Every structure is written in structure tokens, then in C-alpha cells.
Amino acid sequence: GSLVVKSGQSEDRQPVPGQQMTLKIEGDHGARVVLVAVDKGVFVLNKKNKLTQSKIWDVVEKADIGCTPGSGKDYAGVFSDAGLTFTSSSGQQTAQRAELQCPQ
Amino acid sequence: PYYNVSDEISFHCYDGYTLRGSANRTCQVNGRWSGQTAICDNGAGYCSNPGIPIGTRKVGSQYRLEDSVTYHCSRGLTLRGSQRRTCQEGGSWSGTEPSCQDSFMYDTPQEVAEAFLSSLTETIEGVDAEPSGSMNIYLVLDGSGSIGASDFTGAKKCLVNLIEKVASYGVKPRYGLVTYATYPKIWVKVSEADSSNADWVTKQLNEINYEDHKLKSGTNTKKALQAVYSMMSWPDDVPPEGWNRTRHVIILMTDGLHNMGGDPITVIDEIRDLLYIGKDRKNPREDYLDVYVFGVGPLVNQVNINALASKKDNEQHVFKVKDMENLEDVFYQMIDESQSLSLCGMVWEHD
Amino acid sequence: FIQTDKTIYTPGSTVLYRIFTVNHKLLPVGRTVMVNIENPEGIPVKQDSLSSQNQLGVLPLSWDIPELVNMGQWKIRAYYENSPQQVFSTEFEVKEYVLPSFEVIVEPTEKFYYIYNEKGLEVTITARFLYGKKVEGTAFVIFGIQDGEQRISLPESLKRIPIEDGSGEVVLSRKVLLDGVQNPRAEDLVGKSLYVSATVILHSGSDMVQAERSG
Amino acid sequence: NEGFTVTAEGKGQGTLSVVTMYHAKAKDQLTCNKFDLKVTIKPAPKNTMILEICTRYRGDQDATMSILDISMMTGFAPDTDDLKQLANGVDRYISKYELDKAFSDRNTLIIYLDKVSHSEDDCLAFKVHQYFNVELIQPGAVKVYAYYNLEESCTRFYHPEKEDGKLNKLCRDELCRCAEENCFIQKDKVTLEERLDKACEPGVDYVYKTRLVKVQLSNDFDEYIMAIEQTIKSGSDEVQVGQQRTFISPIKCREALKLEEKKHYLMWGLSSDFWGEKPNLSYIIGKDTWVEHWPEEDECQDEENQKQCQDLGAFTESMVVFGCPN
Amino acid sequence: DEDIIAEENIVSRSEFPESWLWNVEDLKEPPKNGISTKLMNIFLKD
Ligand SMILES: *[C@@H]1O[C@H](CO)[C@@H](O)[C@H](O)[C@H]1NC(C)=O
Numbered sequence A: 001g002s003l004v005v006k007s008g009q010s011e012d013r014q015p016v017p018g019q020q021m022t023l024k025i026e027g028d029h030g031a032r033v034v035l036v037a038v039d040k041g042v043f044v045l046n047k048k049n050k051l052t053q054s055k056i057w058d059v060v061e062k063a064d065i066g067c068t069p070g071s072g073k074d075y076a077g078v079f080s081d082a083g084l085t086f087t088s089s090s091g092q093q094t095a096q097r098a099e100l101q102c103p104q
Numbered sequence B: 001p002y003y004n005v006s007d008e009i010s011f012h013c014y015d016g017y018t019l020r021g022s023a024n025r026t027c028q029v030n031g032r033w034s035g036q037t038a039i040c041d042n043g044a045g046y047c048s049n050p051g052i053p054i055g056t057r058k059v060g061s062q063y064r065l066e067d068s069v070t071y072h073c074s075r076g077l078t079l080r081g082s083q084r085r086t087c088q089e090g091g092s093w094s095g096t097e098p099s100c101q102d103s104f105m106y107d108t109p110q111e112v113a114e115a116f117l118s119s120l121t122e123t124i125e126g127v128d129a130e131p132s133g134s135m136n137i138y139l140v141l142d143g144s145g146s147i148g149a150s151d152f153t154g155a156k157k158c159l160v161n162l163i164e165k166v167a168s169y170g171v172k173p174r175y176g177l178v179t180y181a182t183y184p185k186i187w188v189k190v191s192e193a194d195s196s197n198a199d200w201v202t203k204q205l206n207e208i209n210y211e212d213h214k215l216k217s218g219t220n221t222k223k224a225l226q227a228v229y230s231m232m233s234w235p236d237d238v239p240p241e242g243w244n245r246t247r248h249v250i251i252l253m254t255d256g257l258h259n260m261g262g263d264p265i266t267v268i269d270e271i272r273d274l275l276y277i278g279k280d281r282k283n284p285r286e287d288y289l290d291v292y293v294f295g296v297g298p299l300v301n302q303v304n305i306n307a308l309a310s311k312k313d314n315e316q317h318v319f320k321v322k323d324m325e326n327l328e329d330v331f332y333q334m335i336d337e338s339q340s341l342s343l344c345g346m347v348w349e350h351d
Numbered sequence C: 001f002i003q004t005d006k007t008i009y010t011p012g013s014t015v016l017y018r019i020f021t022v023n024h025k026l027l028p029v030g031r032t033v034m035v036n037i038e039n040p041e042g043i044p045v046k047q048d049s050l051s052s053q054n055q056l057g058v059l060p061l062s063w064d065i066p067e068l069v070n071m072g073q074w075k076i077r078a079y080y081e082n083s084p085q086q087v088f089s090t091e092f093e094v095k096e097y098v099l100p101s102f103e104v105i106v107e108p109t110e111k112f113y114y115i116y117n118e119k120g121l122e123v124t125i126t127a128r129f130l131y132g133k134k135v136e137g138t139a140f141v142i143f144g145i146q147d148g149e150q151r152i153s154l155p156e157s158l159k160r161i162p163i164e165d166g167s168g169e170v171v172l173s174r175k176v177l178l179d180g181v182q183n184p185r186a187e188d189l190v191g192k193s194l195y196v197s198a199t200v201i202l203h204s205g206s207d208m209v210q211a212e213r214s215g
Numbered sequence D: 001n002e003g004f005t006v007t008a009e010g011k012g013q014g015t016l017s018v019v020t021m022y023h024a025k026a027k028d029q030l031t032c033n034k035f036d037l038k039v040t041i042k043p044a045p046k047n048t049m050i051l052e053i054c055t056r057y058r059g060d061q062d063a064t065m066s067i068l069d070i071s072m073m074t075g076f077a078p079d080t081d082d083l084k085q086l087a088n089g090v091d092r093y094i095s096k097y098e099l100d101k102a103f104s105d106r107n108t109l110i111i112y113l114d115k116v117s118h119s120e121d122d123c124l125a126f127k128v129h130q131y132f133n134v135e136l137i138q139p140g141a142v143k144v145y146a147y148y149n150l151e152e153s154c155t156r157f158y159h160p161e162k163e164d165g166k167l168n169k170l171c172r173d174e175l176c177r178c179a180e181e182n183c184f185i186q187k188d189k190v191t192l193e194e195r196l197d198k199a200c201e202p203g204v205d206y207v208y209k210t211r212l213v214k215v216q217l218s219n220d221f222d223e224y225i226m227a228i229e230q231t232i233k234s235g236s237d238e239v240q241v242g243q244q245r246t247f248i249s250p251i252k253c254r255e256a257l258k259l260e261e262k263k264h265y266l267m268w269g270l271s272s273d274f275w276g277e278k279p280n281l282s283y284i285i286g287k288d289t290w291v292e293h294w295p296e297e298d299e300c301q302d303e304e305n306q307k308q309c310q311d312l313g314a315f316t317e318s319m320v321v322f323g324c325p326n
Numbered sequence E: 001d002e003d004i005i006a007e008e009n010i011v012s013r014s015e016f017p018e019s020w021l022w023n024v025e026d027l028k029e030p031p032k033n034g035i036s037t038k039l040m041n042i043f044l045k046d
């Protein structure tokens, strides 16, 4: 969907230690937003293990039931390499898959 | 940078934390915040989070068993209650909840009477277990020249109503009236056969006068408490039959401005050792001693009057009303009111 | 997905972390999750079993760090009760430290290094306070070659460049680079990597930050 | 720390481990680690002085680049001329940003070193003038360490008077109280009524008329063995007449006290001036401790002490018979 | 020969957390163009 968090103030200057500021949140409807403010000085000693949208899709992508970027050695191979099992009454069925993860 | 009168502030815990107490608190005219103390606990320690009373500063995040926490008030404020609380076995912190006081906060006649009875009556309910109830009340009145006949004679009438108030509970304890100055002066002793007679103790409280300690208008609180010590002491020989079953309630009015004798606290400790209190990890026996202090003199040192008063959980022993007139009203409301005295979930001695 | 408020904690503070329970379609779902917290020695010290049921797939949690705790790289492992084999993990470091007043960045002119490049390896030293302002001080930079999980420091490649106007400039001569290793042929360094170790110190001597650009 | 007992029961197998954590009295170190820093301050032939700083490294290799974090004493600034000499020197460098500061605000100096031999001591020095004059100056400090390791370092303090730049603090075992204050209360006629009120203050705990028996004075604190001739006001210390109490006072006040043995003194202090566990108490002569010379019997006949003895005399009686009013 | 502000009337800072604002918010405002907006009023640390 979408989620942006900008300043609610009319630009102006920089805030002062101990001042109120409007925090605008442009997110999706019916969505629960969890916040967390952290001093950048913390990322100076360690900036690893940071939750990023890039890492989220990274885990999802590295979990596809497919391995081959495309095509196979035969018709029954194209389906298995893509993530599908084609089986007809004529006798043409795809290869058996035992291992959860991809080969190699 | 500062909160004026009728100013409101709200509290809100983080995610995964429970908020107990009053979320919204308003600054009252008595220089105090309304409602209870706001505490954000996650419930991961053996004892609940002691929290940080408004104006104080807690030092110690660990709430395990045997662990402790220290408190410190801001500059210009007097810490009331305990400065150190230890998480005792059974999920409960020792001492009482701290509270930074200033020099004008005082206590409304209701706040005093309400916190006094809620701490006294409970110490009376347990007493009935079970003539002559197994409880002693030591009335130590200060007659120094630093108080004045005005705030003195008012303190007398204040005690008069107290005796009659206890009498309405159908209980006849052993009283001990003692007015001190440069030297203690015992009017009623707990060993007397008339100590249980509420009437006689009241008349003895009337015969006394502020002019009794005019020639030697000193302030030796130490000797005063020592006089109380001799009343609860024993030859030994005795070892008395039922010494470990008697509750002691010491009530004293004083401005806290002692100058002769030194630190009266030393005597309190001697009393604890005599009654064998806090000398047993399994049997504290803290329920066998209550020390109530009331500020009467114009200049009252809250620091000292607190060091003497006892520190029990959810109980107040330190009191400082606005004026003498209000101190009286505290005991007037008592005689009329009859709080419910029930003994539910109570245990007797202890085949 | 496990989210921790900070990446590093001090012995005594509390670790605020939340767990997100989503299906294979990345949608809120009520499930039962087993959560364990292993010490730097990989031994669970705390285990729970929450349920995101009626919680919109968000499990707020926290863990108190004892004063006397083992410093190192702690770990927060979690997995569904119905899938004990599929376990997710998120690490957080526990150490005694203090938040600096400024940051130190080290970015070479190129994201690599050409062997026959006589010019050498030029590295930029940008240092500014956490509030934007620039840093005035001195820097201590040193290079080194990183073999297969091995580091051979280069004592000869040590420089002291003044940091004026919140920036500096240091160059690693190709001469010193070859002098480091005891191998005459330069085509043997092909495949290895270099790492920079800078250190900025204010003129007041009140703060000192250490940065590094390896790989 | 108690002797507990563990009881296992049932089928299976586990492991029990018990470890106690505490603070051990190792010292021993005497740390300072791989550095031997010796700092000394000396006058000159405003005041201006010489600051010599010697250093050495504990190792088999001449330590690499080190740092000299120096902090001037309040009201002192390094001599610019001498700084230029050390800057142009070999194996020494001082940031240009530091040179151009004048006597404005150069209370902090950093001298970068290229190397420090592990054999002998690489000692340097530079003049330090006093641009601003003020009583009770703050001790300076010098710190040495490598550019890679900051934890392992050594810091020394320097002071014109105070030895090794340390501060006055009455230390006993592991309990020290700051003694950076005045000797006693005060010194313009102190009448009878003056003593009455000042002796009946809420703070005043003990009021004795003692006699200086023996003076055992040291380097950090001076013992003053006094003998209580009479207890005017019985404080929190249960002491009968004839017993001896040990008083303690900083060296700075030894000149102002000028206490002579076999002489009587009227002194009263606060209840917060005690030092030690009973019955081994030791009174402390703090900035709030009254001290007055008590003219002896035959001396109270001079036409100069009659005015004083009469006040003290009436004072004692008024304090014993009636005691503090109010 | 004196001015400035009394050293007694100077409220020194104290709140220097490494992390804060660990709360939860729900977007229930009238949705426009499928985008909900919430205006929070937080108090910056010292
Ligand atoms: C009370 O006194 C008797 C004296 O014989 C003693 O045996 C008993 O233990 C005491 N009770 C308590 C509460 O300890």
C-alpha cells in the first residue's frame, strides 16, 4: 500500500529541545501503525539488523517454490522448475518433488 | 519548567507495559498532585515496580528478590517516607512509598484523618486475638517553649478526642501520658491500674498546662522516648507472659526542633531491639509497633518528624496540618464516623 | 519479523521488541508463536508462547537486561508452534558504551581498487556532529589487506590528516600497498580486499569516534 | 551468602552450576597500565611556572602515536612561545587550530606524539603564565594513551601546593568525606546572647569544655586528643566527664587553630560531624564547629580576660541549670 | 556589577533517552483517496 511520515510543521526552522511538534502520518486505512524514535548516535556503533522493506521482500523472494529462471529440459520440467504440477488422465504428469528447498 | 495550580498532566506507558494508578493528575491548592502515583510496570519482576513518585528519583531497575531501590528528591524538598525499599519475600517492598514534600504542602484535615485511621484501625483489628486489651498507647506531648501555649493547648484537646474515639470501638487499651521539655514528666504509666481507664487519662490530660514547662523550656525528645522505654521495659526476671503479643502505638506531637540529647532516633532503635522487631528474617514483627508523629510548632522540621515516624506500606505516619484548628477537626470527624471493622481473611495465633 | 527498538543495549536497560505474525501473503494472522532469547553462548535464557490472536498480528514484548550480564551478540529466536523447523532470528549487541557527539564516515573515491592504478586508493574522511554541524579536529587513518577471513595490518600506511571544515583527505600510495605483502607480483592481490580505519578527535579532546570501511 | 541445599527427583538428567559474583580486594594495581606519567610543577626564577611532563611505555616496542590531553589550572595558560618550539620539534605536533587562541581560552591543550620509547622517559616541558588570579585554584591533569586503545591509559594531577594534585578528603578504609571547606565557623564581639543562640541551634548536638591533652598530627589529618572537663550539653555521644575524644581537622586549618596542649577550650559541633563506629567515635572540626580558647583559672584575673570569663561562666550555668530555651 | 540569570532559576535538562516513542496508533480518520492521515502532537526530548 503506502506509508509516509513527514513533518506537520510549516517548515520554519529546527525544533528546540523540549518543544511540541506535529507528526503527520499518511498510511493505509484500518491499519495499525507502530512508532519508534531512535537517536542516530545509536547507529554510529551499530547499524546492522535494521528492519527494512527491502529485507522483507528479500525473505519472501528467497522462498519461492521455483528455482529455474525459466524453461526446462522438457514439458514436465517447465512446470516443476516454475512451481506447478501438471497431471493428466492421458499419462503426462510432472516430476515428483521430495525436497522442500531447491536443489543445490 | 513549573506547574501552576489546577494544571493537568497525563501519563502513558509504552507498548507491553501496564499502567496502574491515576493516568490524569491535577495540581491542587495544597501544592500536591491529585490521584495516586503513575507507574508503568511490565510485570516481569518478583515484586511489582515500585514506580517513581512525582518529584522523586528512583535508582534501581532490578525488581528481583532481596533487591533494593533508592529515592532522591529535588533540591529544596524534604523526602517523606523511605529512601530505600527492599523487595521482601512474598512480593512486597519494605518501608513505605516515598513522597517529595516542600514547605507549604501541609495536609488537609481529611487527608490526615483518612490516612491516620486507615493505618491505625488496621493495627487495631489484628490486636483483637484474643479486661485490658493487649495494646499500649503512649501519648508523648511536647511542651517546649518553641511551640507556644496556642499550639499546645490545642494539641491537648486534640488528644482528648482521640482517647474517646478509641473508646467508641469498645476497646480499653493501656495509655501513657508524658509531657516533656528539658526533662520528661510522666503523668500516666502503663503499669498503673488506671491506665486502662479512658476517663482518668483524659482528666490527667486536662490538669496539665503549658506553664508546667516554663521555667525549664527545653527540647530533649531523646529523654522523652526513653521515658516510654522504661514503661515497656522489664526487670528480667520478666520476660513477661504475653510480651510478644502486645502492640505498641506511640503518638507524639512535636515541631521536630530538638536541641538537647542529640538524635532521638537512637532510642527508637533500642525500642525495636527490646520488642525484638526486624531481628528475624522470617518474623519481622513490624505489626507490633506504630509511631505516629504530628507537627504542631510554628517551625516544624519535616526531616526529623519523618525519621521517627514508622514507614509501612500504603500507610501514613507523618502528618502536618495547616493550622491547629484543622488538627482538631481531624479528630472531630473520627468521633462521628464509624468505619466498618470486619475481620475477613484474618489469621489467629499462630495447635 | 522481529523489530528491536535499538541495535545495541547497555547492561541494565530493557530490550523493547515486537513480533509480526503474517502468512505467506504478508497479511495479519492470529497464530501461536514460540519466542526464545539466547545469550552470546547460544543458550536460551527465556522462552514464551504468545498468540497474535485478536492482536492484529502484533506482539509487543520486552526483556530486562540484568546489571551483571554477559556482553556479546545476543539473539532473539522465534517460530510458529506448528512449524518448529522454520525459525526466524534477530540479533542485538549488549555492551558497555557511550553515545558519541558526532559521526565519522569513510567513503573512498571509488567503490573498488584497480591493481595497476598508480594513483593509489584515495579515501574521503567526512565527519559531522549528530545535529548537522561540521567537526573540527584531527584524524588517524590506517589501511590493511584482508585475506580469507584474515587481516594483515599495514603499519606503514599510517597518516595524520587534519580535519578542517568537517572534512579530510587521505591517499594510500600504491608503493606502500605492495610493500605490505611479501609477494612481488601484484596480480596476486587480485581477489583480496582493503579496509580503512579512521579515528576523529576534537580539539577539546572530549570525544573520539572510530570508523571503518572494510570490503 | 548462605549454605543452601539442592534436591533433585524424578527421571532424567540435568546440570547444576553455582557461581558468586563480587568485588575482590585484588589491588595490587596500581594500574596506569603501559604508561609511567610523572608530572611536576615548579616556580620560575603573573607568577608563571614550569610544567615538566615525563612519560614511558611498558612494552617491548616503542609505542606508536600517542596523545597528550593536558588541562591547565584555573587562571593559567601555556606560554605561546614555548608551544611553537615543541610544535616544530621532531616527533611532536600541535594542531594549528590550537596555536591561535592566545590567552583567551587555552585551558585545554592536546600535544600529539609520534612515538614514546619504552626504555627511558621522553620528558618535555613548557612555561605556564597566570593570566587570571583567584583563590582556591583547581588542580590540572595530564592523560596519555594510544590512538587505537583509549581504555588503557594513565592520568596524573598536578597542583602548586597539594601533593600529586590530589584533593583534601578525610579517608578511612573506604569512606571519604570532602574536606574542601573552611576550618571552622568564624572569628565581632560575640556577646553572651550570641553564644546562647548559636549553641541551641537544631544542628548543634554536643557542647563540651575540653582540655587539649595530646596532639598527634600527621600529613592528611591531625588527631586532637581532647579531655571533656564537663558536658554542658549531653549530645548523642554517651560520654562521661574524664573520658577522651579524638578530634580531626585538615592541615590547612592547623595554622588558624593554633591549639596548644594543656589548654582549655569551649567547642560545640554538629551531629553530622561524627566519624567512625561506636564506641570508637571521632569528632570532626568542620566549618560548622565552634572553637574558643578558655582562659584558665588564674588567668581570669587579668584586666583583659575578665570580660571573657564572665561571659563563659554565665554561659555554662545558663546552659546547665535551665538548658537551651524553647 | 552583575546580570545574567540566577543559577537558581535554570531548569537543567535531564531526559536523554537512546530510544522513545514506543506506542501504537490507529488510522480511523475519514479516508480520502484511500489515504488516511493522523496528526500527532509529541514532546521532543532534551
Ligand atoms: C512468645 O513467648 C514465648 C515465651 O515462652 C515463646 O515461647 C514464643 O516463641 C513467643 N512467640 C513468638 C511469636 O515468638
Ligand code: NI
Pocket (backbone or CB within 6 Å): B144, B145, B146, B147, B218, B219, B255, B257, D326
Ligand atoms: Ni522545643
